[PDB]
Design a protein around this ligand. Sequence first.
Ligand SMILES: [Mg+2]
Ligand SMILES: [Mg+2]
Lengths: 65, 72, 66, 41, 59
Amino acid sequence: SNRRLQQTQAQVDEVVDIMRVNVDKVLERDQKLSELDDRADALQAGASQFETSAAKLKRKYWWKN
Amino acid sequence: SLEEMQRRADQLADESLESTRRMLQLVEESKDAGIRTLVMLDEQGEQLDRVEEGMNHINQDMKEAEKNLKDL
Amino acid sequence: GSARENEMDENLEQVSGIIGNLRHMALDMGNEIDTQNRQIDRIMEKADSNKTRIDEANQRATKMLW
Amino acid sequence: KKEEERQEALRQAEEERKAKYAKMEAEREVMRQGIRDKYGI
Amino acid sequence: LSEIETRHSEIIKLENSIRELHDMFMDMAMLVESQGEMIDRIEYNVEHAVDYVERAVSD
Ligand SMILES: [Mg+2]
Ligand SMILES: [Mg+2]
C-alpha cells in the first residue's frame, strides 16, 4: 500500500534536504581549503627565504650562539 | 477490451518492479559513496590536525627568532 | 504474494532500510564538515599570524645584513 | 643597490605565485557554481 | 488499472527522488576526494615551512 510507499518517499525527501545542505557546506569547505592552499604555499615560500636570511645572519655574527 | 486493460496493468506492474530494482542499486552505490566520504573526511581530518600542529610549532619557533633577533 | 509480487515488497522494505542508513551518514557528514570548517578557519588565522611574524622577522633579519 | 633589483624579483615572483592561485580559484568556483545550479543553491 | 495507473507514478516519483539523492552522494564523494588534493599540498607546504623555520632558529 501507500502505507509504506508514501512513508519511504517522505524519508527520501528528508535525506535529500539534509544532503543539499551538506553539499552547501562542502562547497564552503572547498573555498576555505582553496584559500589555505594559497596561504600555506606563500608560507612555505616565506619560511624558505627566512631560513636563507638566518643562515646569512649566523655567518655574519659567527660569534653569537 | 479487458484483454487490453490487462496487458496494460501487467506492463505497468512489470515496470514498477523494474523501478524498485533500480532503486535498490541506486541506494546501494549511495551507501557506498557515503561510507567512502566519511572515510576520506576522517583521513583528511587527521591531515588537518597535523597541519594545525605545524602552525603551533612555527608559532613557538618564531618567538625564539623574535627573542634572538631582539637580542642584537 | 507471487514470486515477483514479493520481490516488489522486499525491495521497497530494503530500500527504506538503506535510506535510514543514508540519513545517519548525511548527519555525520554535515557535523564533520562543520567541525572541520571551524578548524580550517582557526588554521588560517594561525597561518596568517605566522606569515606576518615571518615576513617581519625577515625584514629585521635583512636589515642587519648591511 | 643591486639589492633593490632583487626585492623586485621577489615582489614580481609573488605577484605571479598569487596569479597562479587566482586562476586555480576561478576554475574551482566554476565547478562550485555548476554543482550549485544542479541542486538549487 | 487506476490503482495500478497511479501507484506506478508514485513508484517512479520515488525512484526519481532516489536518483537525486544518489546524485548528491556521488557528487559529495567526488568533492571530498577533490578537496583532498589541496589538503595534501597544504600539508606538504606546511611540513616544509615547519622545517625551514626550525632551521632558521636552531643554530
Ligand atoms: Mg610552492
Ligand atoms: Mg578530526
